[PDB]
Design a protein around this motif. Sequence first.
Motif, PDB file in Angstrom:
ATOM      1  N   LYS A   1       0.882  -1.129   0.000  1.00  0.00           N
ATOM      2  CA  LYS A   1       0.000   0.000   0.000  1.00  0.00           C
ATOM      3  C   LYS A   1       0.916   1.172   0.000  1.00  0.00           C
ATOM      4  O   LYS A   1       1.725   1.287   0.886  1.00  0.00           O
ATOM      5  CB  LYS A   1      -0.873   0.031   1.284  1.00  0.00           C
ATOM      6  N   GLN A  32      -0.869  -0.979  -4.541  1.00  0.00           N
ATOM      7  CA  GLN A  32      -1.947  -0.005  -4.708  1.00  0.00           C
ATOM      8  C   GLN A  32      -1.469   1.325  -4.166  1.00  0.00           C
ATOM      9  O   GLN A  32      -0.957   1.378  -3.056  1.00  0.00           O
ATOM     10  CB  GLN A  32      -3.235  -0.477  -4.032  1.00  0.00           C
ATOM     11  N   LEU A  90       1.274   5.590  -0.552  1.00  0.00           N
ATOM     12  CA  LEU A  90       0.712   6.932  -0.655  1.00  0.00           C
ATOM     13  C   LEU A  90       1.580   7.748  -1.601  1.00  0.00           C
ATOM     14  O   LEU A  90       2.810   7.560  -1.648  1.00  0.00           O
ATOM     15  CB  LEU A  90       0.752   7.616   0.705  1.00  0.00           C
ATOM     16  N   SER A 123      -9.316   9.032 -13.319  1.00  0.00           N
ATOM     17  CA  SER A 123      -9.155   9.437 -11.914  1.00  0.00           C
ATOM     18  C   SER A 123     -10.472   9.893 -11.186  1.00  0.00           C
ATOM     19  O   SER A 123     -11.390  10.507 -11.782  1.00  0.00           O
ATOM     20  CB  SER A 123      -8.068  10.532 -11.859  1.00  0.00           C
ATOM     21  N   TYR A 124     -10.554   9.601  -9.895  1.00  0.00           N
ATOM     22  CA  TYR A 124     -11.687  10.039  -9.041  1.00  0.00           C
ATOM     23  C   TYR A 124     -11.309  11.162  -8.090  1.00  0.00           C
ATOM     24  O   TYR A 124     -12.070  11.560  -7.222  1.00  0.00           O
ATOM     25  CB  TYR A 124     -12.255   8.847  -8.275  1.00  0.00           C
ATOM     26  N   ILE A 125     -10.136  11.722  -8.303  1.00  0.00           N
ATOM     27  CA  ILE A 125      -9.587  12.743  -7.415  1.00  0.00           C
ATOM     28  C   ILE A 125     -10.486  13.995  -7.381  1.00  0.00           C
ATOM     29  O   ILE A 125     -10.513  14.704  -6.377  1.00  0.00           O
ATOM     30  CB  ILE A 125      -8.074  13.007  -7.848  1.00  0.00           C
ATOM     31  N   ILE A 147     -14.396  12.271  -5.608  1.00  0.00           N
ATOM     32  CA  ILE A 147     -14.458  12.013  -4.181  1.00  0.00           C
ATOM     33  C   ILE A 147     -13.218  12.409  -3.415  1.00  0.00           C
ATOM     34  O   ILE A 147     -13.082  12.009  -2.263  1.00  0.00           O
ATOM     35  CB  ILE A 147     -14.794  10.575  -3.862  1.00  0.00           C
ATOM     36  N   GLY A 148     -12.357  13.239  -4.034  1.00  0.00           N
ATOM     37  CA  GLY A 148     -11.147  13.758  -3.393  1.00  0.00           C
ATOM     38  C   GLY A 148     -10.081  12.709  -3.113  1.00  0.00           C
ATOM     39  O   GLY A 148      -9.177  12.963  -2.331  1.00  0.00           O
ATOM     40  N   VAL A 149     -10.202  11.536  -3.743  1.00  0.00           N
ATOM     41  CA  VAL A 149      -9.311  10.432  -3.519  1.00  0.00           C
ATOM     42  C   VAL A 149      -9.196   9.578  -4.807  1.00  0.00           C
ATOM     43  O   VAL A 149     -10.124   9.490  -5.588  1.00  0.00           O
ATOM     44  CB  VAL A 149      -9.789   9.533  -2.309  1.00  0.00           C
ATOM     45  N   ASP A 150      -8.043   8.960  -5.025  1.00  0.00           N
ATOM     46  CA  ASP A 150      -7.849   8.061  -6.154  1.00  0.00           C
ATOM     47  C   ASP A 150      -6.824   6.978  -5.821  1.00  0.00           C
ATOM     48  O   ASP A 150      -5.882   7.214  -5.091  1.00  0.00           O
ATOM     49  CB  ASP A 150      -7.383   8.869  -7.371  1.00  0.00           C
ATOM     50  N   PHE A 151      -7.007   5.778  -6.348  1.00  0.00           N
ATOM     51  CA  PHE A 151      -6.000   4.744  -6.170  1.00  0.00           C
ATOM     52  C   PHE A 151      -5.711   4.064  -7.494  1.00  0.00           C
ATOM     53  O   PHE A 151      -6.599   3.903  -8.338  1.00  0.00           O
ATOM     54  CB  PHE A 151      -6.393   3.721  -5.119  1.00  0.00           C
ATOM     55  N   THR A 176      -4.814  11.913  -2.436  1.00  0.00           N
ATOM     56  CA  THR A 176      -5.969  12.727  -2.056  1.00  0.00           C
ATOM     57  C   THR A 176      -5.838  14.175  -2.525  1.00  0.00           C
ATOM     58  O   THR A 176      -4.738  14.626  -2.831  1.00  0.00           O
ATOM     59  CB  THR A 176      -6.255  12.770  -0.527  1.00  0.00           C
ATOM     60  N   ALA A 177      -6.971  14.902  -2.562  1.00  0.00           N
ATOM     61  CA  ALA A 177      -7.045  16.247  -3.173  1.00  0.00           C
ATOM     62  C   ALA A 177      -6.557  17.285  -2.225  1.00  0.00           C
ATOM     63  O   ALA A 177      -6.646  17.120  -1.025  1.00  0.00           O
ATOM     64  CB  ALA A 177      -8.504  16.581  -3.585  1.00  0.00           C
ATOM     65  N   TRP A 223      -2.296   5.508  -3.269  1.00  0.00           N
ATOM     66  CA  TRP A 223      -3.408   6.396  -2.937  1.00  0.00           C
ATOM     67  C   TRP A 223      -3.006   7.868  -2.956  1.00  0.00           C
ATOM     68  O   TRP A 223      -2.010   8.298  -2.382  1.00  0.00           O
ATOM     69  CB  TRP A 223      -4.041   6.036  -1.572  1.00  0.00           C
TER      70      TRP A 223
END
Lengths: 169, 343
Positions: free
Chosen positions: A6, A53, A8, A29-31, A34-38, A57-58, A55
């Motif tokens: 994992k 994986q 970051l 991307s989902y950044i 939802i302010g987060v992406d992996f 965040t925005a 991670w």
Amino acid sequence: YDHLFKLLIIGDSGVGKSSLLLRFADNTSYITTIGVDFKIRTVEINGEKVKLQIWDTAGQERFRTITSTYYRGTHGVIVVYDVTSAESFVNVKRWLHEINQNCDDVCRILVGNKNDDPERKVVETEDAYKFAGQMGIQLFETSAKENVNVEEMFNCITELVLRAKKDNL
Amino acid sequence: MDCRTKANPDRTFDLVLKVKCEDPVVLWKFPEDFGDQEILQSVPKFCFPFDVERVSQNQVGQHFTFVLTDIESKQRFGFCRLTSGGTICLCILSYLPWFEVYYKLLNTLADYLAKELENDLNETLRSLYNHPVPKANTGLPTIPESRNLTEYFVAVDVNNMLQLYASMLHERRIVIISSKLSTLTACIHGSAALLYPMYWQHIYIPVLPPHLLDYCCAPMPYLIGIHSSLIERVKNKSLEDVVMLNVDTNTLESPFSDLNNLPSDVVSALKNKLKKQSTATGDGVARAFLRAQAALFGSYRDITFCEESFVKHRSSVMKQFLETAINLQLFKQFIDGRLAKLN
């Protein structure tokens, strides 16, 4: 899979984290949703199957300091600055100090992205290398745009994390 | 730096859509030429953030508010009116946290649509859309006026309010579960607001749609709502240590004992006030939590902040708490914000 790790990725918005995440991923991307992406990377190191994986965040740039709660459960961190922005570097030094003091068990590497426009560069190599040196960490300068030194960088953090795990066993 | 609301957004709202359940179908949007295709794809999925196939028919008519987080970590509020049967949903997307206003506006838009009043609808939309964001009518949440706190408070036992509070104050990974989206988003918004003057600084998703369930595996702190029809799928994933509250039954499960880490005098003062009849109206509940925040972090009064002077208290329970409090991103942003303005 044999192992799972994992990661970051931290750094100011506008340093190219999402371009780096595109190079990382196996797939595409989902950044901004939802302010987060992996992203998922699979690699074989000496016969062993490893799934990483990572991670993001925005809005991380609003954190003067990213605190120890952020890193729980994480094996490794890619701390990214932008070689054309002096402010992105200063922040990154604060974060790696907090990591050093409160999370020294986490593997981390420093990354100078956007090493593409000489005319616009401001963080000199020897500076970053000297800071890297005093934190006892390895440094990579990369271009997510041109795809330069990026694979080298990913294979480093990947190897670091695999060894911490076997050196713990 | 501190708050997750956009100060001065460009518009009172950015989009209004009527959506129906392959993906959901947009039947109607304003503005007609809305151009952000990423929002057009995601917003419909957040309008029906549940296993439609299985529980559509169990859905009761309700209002709920999703949040989409932008590049700056600012919140875009998705104010939704979901019709009984859960097949049709009306949605206004705005940076303005105007829950009571937009809930009313959604009912009024629904009535204009049923009475086939197209001009009046377009007029109302236009006029409000091109209206400069109004800063005056032209404060602590109170019960029953503020719908998120009110629904939180009626749905969630006092003990569980205290547990969620404690968990937030250790920046845990929190999942809230409900069969009602109204209750679900309400619990997430209302619980988070009781941090005031601090705000939750990490992953913040009042309702998480099915295609994004894998995000419950995030290693970083988070506050996430899941509809009850998705909890089995989530549980079957490989999660980190997470705090879960199932509001349908007021069942909390957590491998931590975070509430035990808070000083007992604060907890019993907060608890005793929450159980008091009169606290249940006006600003009593918010004031009670405001006062708990003061007792826990108030000693911060003491330009720079000295961590070692703040962490030095006499009681072992409070000293212990203050030593963890300095590692909270929510506390860190509050202090840093306050150091910025003090100049």
